[PDB]
Every structure is written in structure tokens, then in C-alpha cells.
Amino acid sequence: VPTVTTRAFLPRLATAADSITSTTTTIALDPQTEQSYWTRVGDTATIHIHLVGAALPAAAPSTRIYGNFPPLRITPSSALAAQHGVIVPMQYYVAPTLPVGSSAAARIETGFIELGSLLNGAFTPLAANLIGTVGYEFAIDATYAAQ
Amino acid sequence: VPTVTTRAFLPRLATAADSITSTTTTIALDPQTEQSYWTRVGDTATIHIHLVGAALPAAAPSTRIYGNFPPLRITPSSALAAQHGVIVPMQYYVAPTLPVGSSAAARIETGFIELGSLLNGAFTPLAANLIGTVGYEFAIDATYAAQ
Amino acid sequence: PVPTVTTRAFLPRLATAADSITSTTTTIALDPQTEQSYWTRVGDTATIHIHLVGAALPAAAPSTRIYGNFPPLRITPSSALAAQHGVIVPMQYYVAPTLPVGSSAAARIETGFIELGSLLNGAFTPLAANLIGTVGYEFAIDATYAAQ
Numbered sequence: 001v002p003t004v005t006t007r008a009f010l011p012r013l014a015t016a017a018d019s020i021t022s023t024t025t026t027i028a029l030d031p032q033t034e035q036s037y038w039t040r041v042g043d044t045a046t047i048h049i050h051l052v053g054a055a056l057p058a059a060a061p062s063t064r065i066y067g068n069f070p071p072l073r074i075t076p077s078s079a080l081a082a083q084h085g086v087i088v089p090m091q092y093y094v095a096p097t098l099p100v101g102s103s104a105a106a107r108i109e110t111g112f113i114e115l116g117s118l119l120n121g122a123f124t125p126l127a128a129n130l131i132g133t134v135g136y137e138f139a140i141d142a143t144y145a146a147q
Numbered sequence: 148v149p150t151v152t153t154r155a156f157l158p159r160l161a162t163a164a165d166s167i168t169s170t171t172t173t174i175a176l177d178p179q180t181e182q183s184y185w186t187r188v189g190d191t192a193t194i195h196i197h198l199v200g201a202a203l204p205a206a207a208p209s210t211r212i213y214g215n216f217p218p219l220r221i222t223p224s225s226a227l228a229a230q231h232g233v234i235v236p237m238q239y240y241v242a243p244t245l246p247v248g249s250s251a252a253a254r255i256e257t258g259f260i261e262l263g264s265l266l267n268g269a270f271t272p273l274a275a276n277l278i279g280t281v282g283y284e285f286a287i288d289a290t291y292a293a294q
Numbered sequence: 295p296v297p298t299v300t301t302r303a304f305l306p307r308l309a310t311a312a313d314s315i316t317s318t319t320t321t322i323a324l325d326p327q328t329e330q331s332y333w334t335r336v337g338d339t340a341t342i343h344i345h346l347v348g349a350a351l352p353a354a355a356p357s358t359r360i361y362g363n364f365p366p367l368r369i370t371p372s373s374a375l376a377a378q379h380g381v382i383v384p385m386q387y388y389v390a391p392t393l394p395v396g397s398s399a400a401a402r403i404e405t406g407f408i409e410l411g412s413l414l415n416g417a418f419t420p421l422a423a424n425l426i427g428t429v430g431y432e433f434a435i436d437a438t439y440a441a442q
């Protein structure tokens with residue numbers, strides 16, 4: 001018999017040297033303006049993330065969101081590459097710099113959510129100094145199955 | 148304990164002078180061919196909207212859908228701009244005219260759903276005379292958390 | 295009534311066809327798979343995860359489809375003179391396909407099957423089976439929709 005659980009949470013923005021390592025640097029957050037939350041009913045998780053900041057993080061190849069949202073159900077893939085995840089679009093209120101022809105996207109993994117871009121079905125991580133213009137403001141909305 | 152509610156509903160197509168105003172014009176609908184519906188289980192809402200019409204509405208800057216679907220859960224934003232919402236793709240069976248490089252999209256807000264286009268994560272409202280060719284036919288499919 | 299939750303692994307069946315309407319299909323022999331495909335349904339809300347990998351592209355055909363026991367999409371059946379109306383979603387490629395210029399990778403979810411294709415100005419176009427990869431293929435489809 002299903003339960004429903006709905007919680008506000010505080011996403012943690014963090015950067016890393018690549019899309020594989022568990023070593024990260026936490027980015028200090030300005031005061032936020034829009035509540036981030038998640039809900040889970042049965043094994044179905046829906047997340048809403050919004051973050052705003054006045055200054056872009058220092059340059060790093062991987063830009064991630066951590067938090068207590070339900071962990072994605074997916075078979076763990078090879079440790080030699082980024083873990084397989086679910087690719088979703090995302091929204092920018094302040095313009096990022098994306099590769100030509102690509103759309104704004106995020107890779108939802110069991111361990112974290114990575115910001116990036118999408119072209120011909122392929123996800124490419126977005127560097128932390130390119131996720132906005134001077135500062136940043138973006139949102140991620142998605143539904144996926146939890147473990 | 149969660150409940151499940153699944154209902155057919157009659158979407159209302161309406162246009163407005165901008166993406167903020169509460170002044171709207173309801174568009175008279177042709178007989179519809181496909182059932183529009185929503186379902187809510189716990190706080191998770193899934194909507195299916197389909198509308199067909201033989202003649203495009205009179206040109207207006209904002210094209211909106213109203214109905215009794217579960218209201219989006221999101222922090223209300225400034226009244227000086229369109230309310231923050233969830234951006235989703237949408238489907239056209241009759242071709243629209245979109246900005247170059249953009250994808251067909253919809254902005255789901257607590258108050259209504261707005262048709263538009265999506266480029267580099269940014270949503271732009273689509274004018275009512277551009278949502279088709281002579282006539283129109285489109286669908287919007289999404290899942291989001293409700294209040 | 296009170297909602298139930300059902301979560302199940304499943305074995306997607308890859309099939310090709312001569313168009314996007316016909317019930318005539320050719321089942322494609324699958325390699326050993328590396329990632330579990332599954333679906334879950336709570337109330338009338340279905341979420342699917344499909345992953346398929348193969349060393350060799352299927353023989354060329356205009357429609358590339360996935361069949362399985364996932365919850366059937368709730369949608370009014372449309373004219374038999376065209377592909378059934380469905381829900382269009384994005385999809386992911388681990389091995390590069392050949393898509394129409396300017397289009398994004400997409401899938402069309404129908405009550406009867408899921409079809410691979412591309413998306414441009416809101417319009418879905420089916421993708422031929424000899425173009426769903428390079429030499430071989432590897433892709434994933436993730437979606438949530440209402441079931442009947």
C-alpha cells in the first residue's frame with residue numbers, strides 16, 4: 001500500500017574535477033527566493049529545484065546538485081565513466097553558455113544531479129563558470145522512479 | 148495515505164495582451180476529437196491536453212490554457228513578470244511558427260498553462276496567430292507536483 | 295478506491311516495421327543486456343525506464359518500435375489512416391544516431407508500443423532502424439504518463 005511523502009529541501013550546489021569523482025567543492029549559497037521540494041508516492045519521485053546566486057562559481061568541468069531527494073532507481077554502470085542517469089530538460093532565468101545547437105539539460109543520477117546540455121540524444125556536462133551570466137538562476141523539474 | 152483521482156476535463160483556450168494580465172479572451176472551440184484529462188495520485192499530477200481547431204485565433208501575445216487540473220506547487224514570484232513555472236515540451240500536429248533554433252514548449256503555472264518556445268533554457272510566449280497553419284492542433288503532456 | 299503500487303522489471307522487445315501504422319513487425323534478436331528496464335505504476339500514473347544495447351544495427355526499416363508489458367497509455371484512439379496519437383518524450387543516446395538537422399532525439403509513446411524518432415517544431419518523425427546508432431546502438435527512454 002502506497003505512502004505519499006512531500007518535503008521542502010535545501011539543494012546543495014557543488015562542483016568537481018570531472019563527472020566521475022565523489023570529491024566535490026561546496027558552493028556558498030546566497031539567500032534563496034523559491035522553495036525547492038520533492039514528493040514521492042509509491043516509487044514515483046517528482047522534484048523541483050530552484051537556485052539563484054549573484055556570482056558564478058570558479059571554473060570546474062562538473063556542476064552538481066546534492067540533496068535528500070529520492071535516489072534514482074537504475075543499474076550502476078562502469079566506474080570508468082559518468083554513471084548512467086536520466087536526462088531531462090532544465091530552465092534558465094539567467095542565460096548560460098551552451099554548445100551551439102544544444103538544449104539546456106540535467107543528468108539525474110542516483111548520487112546527484114549534473115547540469116549540462118543535450119545534442120542528438122547525448123548529454124554533455126556544463127562547466128561551473130558557464131551556468132549563467134555574471135550570476136546564475138535556474139530550475140530543474142523531473143519525475144523518475146526511486147529505489 | 149494517498150488517494151487517486153482521474154478525471155476528463157474541458158480545457159479552455161484563451162488569449163491575453165501579455166503574460167501577466169488577468170484580462171483574457173476565451174476562444175470558441177470546435178468539436179474536439181481527443182479526450183483531455185488529468186490524474187492526481189498523492190501530490191503528483193499528470194495532465195493530458197489536446198485541442199484542435201479549424202481557424203487560428205486572432206493574434207495576441209499570450210496563448211493560455213485554463214482548466215480544473217491540479218494547481219502547480221510553486222512559490223509565487225514577482226507580479227512584474229510572468230509567474231515562475233515548469234517548462235515542458237509540447238507536440239504540434241499542425242505546424243506552428245517558432246523562433247529560429249527553438250523547440251515547442253509550454254509554461255505550466257499555478258494559474259494556467261502558456262504556449263511558447265524554448266531556447267537555451269529560456270521560455271518565450273508564442274503569439275496566438277502562430278500556434279498553427281490556418282488552423283491548429285496540439286497536445287501538452289506533463290507531470291508536476293500539486294498544492 | 296485506494297491506490298496500489300506495482301514495480302516490475304521487464305524485457306523490452308525491439309521490433310521494426312514497414313511503416314508507423316501496420317501490425318506487421320519483425321522482432322530483432324537482442325544481445326545480452328547490461329542495464330535493467332523497468333516500470334512502476336501508482337494509481338493511474340506509469341513511469342517507464344528502458345535501456346537497450348546492441349553490437350549491430352537492425353536491417354533498415356522505417357519504423358523502430360519497442361513492445362512490452364508496461365502500462366498501456368491512456369489516450370483516445372485516433373484515425374487508422376495515420377500513426378496513432380501518442381505522447382512525445384525526449385530520449386537518450388549513448389551511441390550516436392543519425393537525426394534530421396535541427397531535430398532532437400525523441401520517442402512516441404502509444405498505447406500499443408513505443409516508437410523511436412526525432413522532434414522538430416513540435417512534430418515527431420519516426421527514425422529508421424539503420425540510423426538508431428553507429429555500427430551498433432545503445433539508448434534509453436524515460437517517461438511518465440497516465441495508464442488505462
Ligand SMILES: [Cl-]
Nearest residue numbers: 307361362363
Ligand atoms: Cl511482446
